[PDB]
Design a protein around this motif. Sequence first.
Motif, mmCIF file in Angstrom:
data_model
loop_
_atom_site.group_PDB
_atom_site.id
_atom_site.type_symbol
_atom_site.label_atom_id
_atom_site.label_comp_id
_atom_site.label_asym_id
_atom_site.label_seq_id
_atom_site.Cartn_x
_atom_site.Cartn_y
_atom_site.Cartn_z
ATOM 1 N N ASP A 102 -5.079 4.204 -4.224
ATOM 2 C CA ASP A 102 -5.787 3.519 -5.301
ATOM 3 C C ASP A 102 -5.292 3.960 -6.673
ATOM 4 O O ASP A 102 -5.247 3.151 -7.606
ATOM 5 C CB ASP A 102 -7.292 3.764 -5.174
ATOM 6 C CG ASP A 102 -8.120 2.827 -6.039
ATOM 7 O OD1 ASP A 102 -7.536 1.968 -6.736
ATOM 8 O OD2 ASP A 102 -9.362 2.949 -6.020
ATOM 9 N N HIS A 114 -4.068 -3.046 -1.508
ATOM 10 C CA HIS A 114 -4.664 -3.909 -2.523
ATOM 11 C C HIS A 114 -4.967 -5.313 -2.023
ATOM 12 O O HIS A 114 -5.430 -6.142 -2.815
ATOM 13 C CB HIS A 114 -3.750 -3.998 -3.745
ATOM 14 C CG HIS A 114 -3.704 -2.742 -4.555
ATOM 15 N ND1 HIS A 114 -2.844 -1.705 -4.271
ATOM 16 C CD2 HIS A 114 -4.407 -2.362 -5.647
ATOM 17 C CE1 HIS A 114 -3.024 -0.736 -5.150
ATOM 18 N NE2 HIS A 114 -3.965 -1.110 -5.997
ATOM 19 N N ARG A 115 -4.705 -5.606 -0.753
ATOM 20 C CA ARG A 115 -4.997 -6.923 -0.205
ATOM 21 C C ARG A 115 -6.470 -7.267 -0.393
ATOM 22 O O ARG A 115 -7.354 -6.420 -0.246
ATOM 23 C CB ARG A 115 -4.622 -6.965 1.275
ATOM 24 C CG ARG A 115 -4.810 -8.313 1.933
ATOM 25 C CD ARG A 115 -4.299 -8.274 3.355
ATOM 26 N NE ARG A 115 -2.849 -8.134 3.405
ATOM 27 C CZ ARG A 115 -2.164 -7.904 4.519
ATOM 28 N NH1 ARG A 115 -2.801 -7.792 5.677
ATOM 29 N NH2 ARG A 115 -0.844 -7.790 4.478
ATOM 30 N N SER A 116 -6.726 -8.526 -0.728
ATOM 31 C CA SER A 116 -8.081 -8.987 -0.981
ATOM 32 C C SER A 116 -8.721 -9.504 0.304
ATOM 33 O O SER A 116 -8.026 -9.997 1.198
ATOM 34 C CB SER A 116 -8.077 -10.097 -2.028
ATOM 35 O OG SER A 116 -7.439 -11.258 -1.528
ATOM 36 N N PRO A 117 -10.048 -9.400 0.420
ATOM 37 C CA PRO A 117 -10.702 -9.834 1.662
ATOM 38 C C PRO A 117 -10.713 -11.338 1.848
ATOM 39 O O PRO A 117 -10.893 -11.809 2.977
ATOM 40 C CB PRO A 117 -12.124 -9.276 1.520
ATOM 41 C CG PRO A 117 -12.341 -9.206 0.046
ATOM 42 C CD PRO A 117 -11.009 -8.854 -0.553
ATOM 43 N N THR A 118 -10.537 -12.109 0.775
ATOM 44 C CA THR A 118 -10.664 -13.558 0.873
ATOM 45 C C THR A 118 -9.370 -14.234 1.311
ATOM 46 O O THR A 118 -9.413 -15.341 1.861
ATOM 47 C CB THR A 118 -11.116 -14.135 -0.469
ATOM 48 O OG1 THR A 118 -10.124 -13.858 -1.467
ATOM 49 C CG2 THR A 118 -12.434 -13.510 -0.891
ATOM 50 N N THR A 119 -8.219 -13.603 1.078
ATOM 51 C CA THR A 119 -6.949 -14.291 1.290
ATOM 52 C C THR A 119 -6.419 -14.132 2.710
ATOM 53 O O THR A 119 -5.941 -15.104 3.303
ATOM 54 C CB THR A 119 -5.914 -13.793 0.280
ATOM 55 O OG1 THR A 119 -5.774 -12.372 0.395
ATOM 56 C CG2 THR A 119 -6.333 -14.155 -1.137
ATOM 57 N N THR A 152 -7.796 -12.686 5.845
ATOM 58 C CA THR A 152 -8.846 -12.173 6.724
ATOM 59 C C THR A 152 -8.307 -11.465 7.963
ATOM 60 O O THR A 152 -8.479 -10.250 8.099
ATOM 61 C CB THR A 152 -9.770 -13.312 7.155
ATOM 62 O OG1 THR A 152 -9.016 -14.290 7.883
ATOM 63 C CG2 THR A 152 -10.403 -13.972 5.940
ATOM 64 N N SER A 183 -13.253 -5.469 1.704
ATOM 65 C CA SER A 183 -12.185 -4.777 0.990
ATOM 66 C C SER A 183 -12.207 -3.283 1.283
ATOM 67 O O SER A 183 -11.154 -2.642 1.377
ATOM 68 C CB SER A 183 -12.306 -5.032 -0.512
ATOM 69 O OG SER A 183 -13.483 -4.439 -1.033
ATOM 70 N N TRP A 241 -10.418 -2.931 4.467
ATOM 71 C CA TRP A 241 -8.972 -2.952 4.268
ATOM 72 C C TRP A 241 -8.465 -1.624 3.728
ATOM 73 O O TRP A 241 -7.399 -1.148 4.133
ATOM 74 C CB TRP A 241 -8.570 -4.087 3.327
ATOM 75 C CG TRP A 241 -8.651 -5.427 3.957
ATOM 76 C CD1 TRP A 241 -9.628 -6.357 3.784
ATOM 77 C CD2 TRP A 241 -7.724 -5.983 4.891
ATOM 78 N NE1 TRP A 241 -9.360 -7.469 4.542
ATOM 79 C CE2 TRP A 241 -8.196 -7.262 5.234
ATOM 80 C CE3 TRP A 241 -6.537 -5.526 5.467
ATOM 81 C CZ2 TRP A 241 -7.524 -8.088 6.127
ATOM 82 C CZ3 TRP A 241 -5.872 -6.347 6.353
ATOM 83 C CH2 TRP A 241 -6.366 -7.613 6.674
ATOM 84 N N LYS A 242 -9.211 -1.010 2.811
ATOM 85 C CA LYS A 242 -8.789 0.284 2.285
ATOM 86 C C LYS A 242 -8.809 1.347 3.374
ATOM 87 O O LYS A 242 -7.916 2.202 3.444
ATOM 88 C CB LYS A 242 -9.679 0.682 1.112
ATOM 89 C CG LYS A 242 -9.529 -0.247 -0.079
ATOM 90 C CD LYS A 242 -10.387 0.176 -1.257
ATOM 91 C CE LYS A 242 -10.206 -0.783 -2.427
ATOM 92 N NZ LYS A 242 -11.044 -0.425 -3.605
ATOM 93 N N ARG A 260 -6.848 -19.118 2.511
ATOM 94 C CA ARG A 260 -7.997 -18.238 2.350
ATOM 95 C C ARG A 260 -9.066 -18.513 3.403
ATOM 96 O O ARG A 260 -9.189 -19.630 3.902
ATOM 97 C CB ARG A 260 -8.586 -18.392 0.947
ATOM 98 C CG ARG A 260 -9.224 -19.748 0.690
ATOM 99 C CD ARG A 260 -9.640 -19.894 -0.762
ATOM 100 N NE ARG A 260 -8.483 -19.963 -1.649
ATOM 101 C CZ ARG A 260 -8.556 -19.953 -2.977
ATOM 102 N NH1 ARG A 260 -9.736 -19.878 -3.579
ATOM 103 N NH2 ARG A 260 -7.448 -20.018 -3.702
#
Lengths: 186, 163, 49, 84, 44
Positions: B63, B125-130, B132, B156, B159-160, E44
């Motif tokens: 981070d 840093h991957r986002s949870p919405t993009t 899954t 998220s 993912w971390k 998404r």
Amino acid sequence: PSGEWDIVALPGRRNENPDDSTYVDITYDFIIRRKPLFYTINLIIPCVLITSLAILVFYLPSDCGEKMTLCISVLLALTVFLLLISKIVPPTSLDVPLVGKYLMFTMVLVTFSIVTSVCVLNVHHRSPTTHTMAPWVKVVFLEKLPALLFMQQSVSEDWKYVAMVIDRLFLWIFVFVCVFGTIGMF
Amino acid sequence: PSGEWDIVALPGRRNENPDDSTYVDITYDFIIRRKPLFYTINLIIPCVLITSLAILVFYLPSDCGEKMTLCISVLLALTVFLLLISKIVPPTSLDVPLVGKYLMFTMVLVTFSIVTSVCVLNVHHRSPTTHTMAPWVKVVFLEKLPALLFMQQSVSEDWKYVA
Amino acid sequence: TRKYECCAEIYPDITYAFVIRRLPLFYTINLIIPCLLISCLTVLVFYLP
Amino acid sequence: VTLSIVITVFVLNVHHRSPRTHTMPTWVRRVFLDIVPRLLLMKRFERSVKEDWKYVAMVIDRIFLWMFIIVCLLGTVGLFLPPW
Amino acid sequence: VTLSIVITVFVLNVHHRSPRTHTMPTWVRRVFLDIVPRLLLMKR
């Protein structure tokens, strides 16, 4: 006047070897003193100037995330100065120059500094959902706090407080050991 | 005494060639032992000093975003030491100095470290919405976690933890 | 044999040609492998978010 | 420049500080909120303390910058005077 | 690599921009939101 070098005294003595009985020679001894005003300004002052920054990486706040850049750059410049002073000093394995010894010592010290800095920076970011570890930490740190003359005081900031306490402790011991590192050659 | 180099022994031997019946010579052999302290302080201490950061970079958290600076600084300094230690050794392809061999090996190690670090930083840093992609990862990593002797446990954060 | 500008006669000469090779191991262990290794990062930065 | 780096790491450690840990604002508020009108700078629960603690850092940074530029210019004038 | 650095500063600028400043989505949405199947990238 030769400039850089000053002459103290120039005695000359004759040597005769009694056992051989055929060896006769004259030895002139030159005791030469270096005028240090040139080398001082050019090497010693930048050396102490950059090595005064070893104690500095700890006082930087960990959440800013700039400890690594400063400490690595200090270590790099210190290695550069070590190589330079090694190039200018005569390559004699019989004796070690004092400045090179001090620089190697403080370089190992800066390595210890960077490893403890990465440790505190890693423990700084731990979120409460991952590494809860509450009881073993609270009982020890609430009591350790007054022993350091540190000012008295959700969990996400508790981890930051842990990091600050531990790196302040490292700084307290670090300046102490650096004082002796300087005194050793006072 | 000359300083750096110390003599061990000075044998001398007369070489006679029975084939030529005329070639005669005297060969003196000098076996010389370098005093180590100079090159020790100048090379070995910095080399073994900076080589720890290569395996140390992984303990750094993702981070904060300081993995790249650490690893690139280490790799650049290591290439510099490699070139410097190659400049002093005589350019003979007959053999490789063991220090250079070990340093090239740790260079391959750190250049594998840089790519695994950029990979973990990307999956961090991957986002949870993009992206899954839950079920293929859930079971496998939640089974692997206890085998690694690591402490057990909004997407998220998951993912971390995976990173 | 050759014929130069000075004179009318021809002059002899002997040409020795040395064809030699360089042992490659040193420069391939200290010069080309570092750059070939650090050239594999120019494509890596695009995958970095 | 090394004095500059040490003073700027000092002001970083003072700025990036948190309200719940090192509050201690009693003596600092009275002094570092009234030097500002002398310095000719126009003025503006935990977020309020954070903003105040940022403002004090900005003010000390400016009050150091003034003296530092004065010293630098006077030095560059003093050293190269005898040739001209 | 210098072509890479210029294209990556371009993509950084494309990333950090805000909705109220650089909206311009009319030509972009139809072309850049229908290329992820052509590139095998899940939505998404």
